Design an enzyme around this catalytic site. Structure first.
Site, PDB file in Angstrom:
ATOM      1  N   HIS A 191       0.761  -1.167   0.010  1.00 34.45           N
ATOM      2  CA  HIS A 191       0.092  -0.103  -0.032  1.00 34.45           C
ATOM      3  C   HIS A 191       0.809   1.387   0.057  1.00 34.45           C
ATOM      4  O   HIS A 191       0.312   2.557   0.312  1.00 34.45           O
ATOM      5  CB  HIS A 191      -0.898   0.006   1.285  1.00 34.45           C
ATOM      6  CG  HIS A 191      -0.516   0.183   2.418  1.00 34.45           C
ATOM      7  ND1 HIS A 191      -0.242  -0.845   3.304  1.00 34.45           N
ATOM      8  CD2 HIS A 191      -0.193   1.257   3.518  1.00 34.45           C
ATOM      9  CE1 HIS A 191       0.247  -0.361   4.446  1.00 34.45           C
ATOM     10  NE2 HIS A 191       0.485   1.022   4.435  1.00 34.45           N
TER      11      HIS A 191
ATOM     12  N   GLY B 166       3.314   6.180  10.125  1.00 36.80           N
ATOM     13  CA  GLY B 166       4.625   6.238   9.412  1.00 36.80           C
ATOM     14  C   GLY B 166       5.304   5.148  10.091  1.00 36.80           C
ATOM     15  O   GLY B 166       6.559   5.098   9.434  1.00 36.80           O
TER      16      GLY B 166
ATOM     17  N   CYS C 266       4.445   1.986   9.361  1.00 39.87           N
ATOM     18  CA  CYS C 266       4.054   0.979   8.368  1.00 39.87           C
ATOM     19  C   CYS C 266       5.307   0.341   7.766  1.00 39.87           C
ATOM     20  O   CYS C 266       6.066   1.175   7.248  1.00 39.87           O
ATOM     21  CB  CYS C 266       3.053   1.210   7.134  1.00 39.87           C
ATOM     22  SG  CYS C 266       1.368   2.066   7.908  1.00 39.87           S
TER      23      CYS C 266
END
Lengths: 306, 301
Positions: free
Chosen positions: B41, B143, B145
């Site tokens: 993503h 942030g 991820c």
């Protein structure tokens, strides 16, 4: 999203861990520039430890007597000296991995990360707090001496603790990186007692703010309390009295949650007298005091509606 | 002495952490050799992740969109790709700090260290347990991820988890390093059912041994019980059924203390039935299932 007891990344400190051997004694050392710092009891033997004359024993040791290993590479000890309880071994090679560092002396209540090492190899990392009685509740075993505590502030590693010994109660004792012990301890095999351990109230209040931020509000009540009449309850339950500077340090968390500090003190007072009655705060059945307000802000960073 | 929740030294993983950017989206990547792994993503923005088509979004993107950064130094993308829910970006520079590694898929009940990262920069290291309902008791901010979960075996770093999404329901979702999500979760931002969470029985029994080794033994009783009787009590308190494979793993812990597996089950049965009534075990007033038998052996040996 979430709240965990978290240690700082240990990478910068692993690059400094070395193995220090002196005769029959093996422990860990911290290689910063061309100096290796380690507990001075490394120059002793178990018999010496009964009443060691560190100055006399250090006279009898030579640069050849110290064997320093940085992984598979051996380091040449070109000089030695003692500063309080720490031994400083000057090596020929400077550590290329030396980060931006400083030796600091933390206060009780304050937290730091501990990198536990055995034979100069890092084994694990955990977050610790300097108890008000100047001991730490850690996990260390034979060969852990020389393991360091530190905090990371931007690019700088602040070394504050070096492990030296374990007390009869199972708690640990050590020095700052200047050899000065935290508490009334000595590096001598004698009967030693840690002292009375009070609960760090500013940290308990911070943890209650972290629980509210994460959706725990059963303990919140309409009641309020005064600073003076809270410290009376804090005397009965062996909690540290709350100073004004501590109330101010909780300012940002109070401002964020919209729960006034004394309203959190009232909730704390209620949990001390009545108990939690089966309910849990952040999945813990007890009140946690090992998180400073700064640790809570670091994870529970939110917006403030001024 | 002393029993702490310990995380693995994170140095070998910090050298692998890079900041991956695609569009106006910025997360973390794991740079191993000339390949950077990250949540797929990264191509999406604050408006695509409701229900997106990842196959048609990967076609729409070229190597100019992806900007991989390794701190002060910048990395150039030489070939994007996708395996399951992860995005693999090939790079020109091979990672010099790549440690000896392997990709594994942990089973529920097993533990690992998570290195939390924000804009490719490591923030903290904590130890997690993979819950039976395939969720983690984590702490991740925006942030984070692409933050990875790992185990360290001597020099070999076993990467087993990658952080993808923080569910609206609270809990955190992620994949193995091959891209396969843990449990019934997807890379779409919607309320997803976590599941029924049982207590990891093998981990509580290992924690009871850690307490014995560290002087805590008030909970120990003369009594003993058989598997069939214990498994009945296990159902009453939401505890995992104890299998015969679970008995074999607790052997070395039982040998070190003297207390046999079935004898410690009789203490656990009584602790569940009566509670603790004021007392604590290893400084905890609640039973702990976040420590595998290997985690207990790791510290107490």
């Amino acid at each position: 999203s979430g709240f965990r007891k978290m240690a700082f990344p240990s990478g910068k400190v692993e690059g400094c861990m070395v193995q220090v051997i002196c005769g029959t004694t093996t422990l860990n050392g911290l290689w910063l520039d061309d100096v290796v710092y380690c507990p001075r009891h490394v120059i002793c033997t178990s018999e010496d430890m009964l009443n060691p004359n560190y100055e006399d024993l250090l006279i009898r040791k030579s640069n050849h007597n110290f064997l320093v290993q940085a992984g598979n590479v051996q380091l040449r000890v070109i000089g030695h000296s003692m500063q309080n309880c720490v031994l400083k071994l000057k090596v020929d090679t400077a550590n290329p991995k030396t980060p931006k560092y400083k030796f600091v002396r933390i206060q009780p209540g304050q937290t730091f990360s501990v990198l536990a090492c055995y034979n100069g190899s890092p084994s694990g990392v955990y977050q610790c707090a300097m108890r008000p009685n100047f001991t730490i509740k850690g996990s260390f075993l034979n060969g852990s001496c020389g393991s360091v505590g530190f905090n990371i502030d931007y690019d700088c590693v602040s070394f504050c603790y070096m492990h030296h010994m374990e007390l009869p109660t199972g708690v640990h004792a050590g020095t700052d990186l200047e050899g000065n012990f935290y508490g009334p301890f000595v590096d001598r095999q004698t009967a030693q007692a840690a002292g009375t351990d009070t609960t760090i109230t500013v940290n308990v209040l911070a943890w209650l703010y972290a629980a509210v931020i994460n959706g725990d509000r059963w303990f919140l009540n309409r009641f309020t309390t005064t600073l003076n009449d809270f410290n009376l309850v804090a005397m009965k339950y062996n909690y540290e009295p709350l100073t004004q500077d501590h109330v101010d340090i909780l300012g940002p968390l109070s401002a964020q949650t919209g729960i006034a500090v004394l309203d959190m003190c009232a909730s704390l007072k209620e949990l001390l007298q009545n108990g939690m009655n089966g309910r849990t705060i952040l999945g813990s059945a007890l009140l946690e005091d090992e998180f400073t307000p700064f640790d809570v802000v670091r994870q529970c960073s939110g917006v403030i509606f001024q």
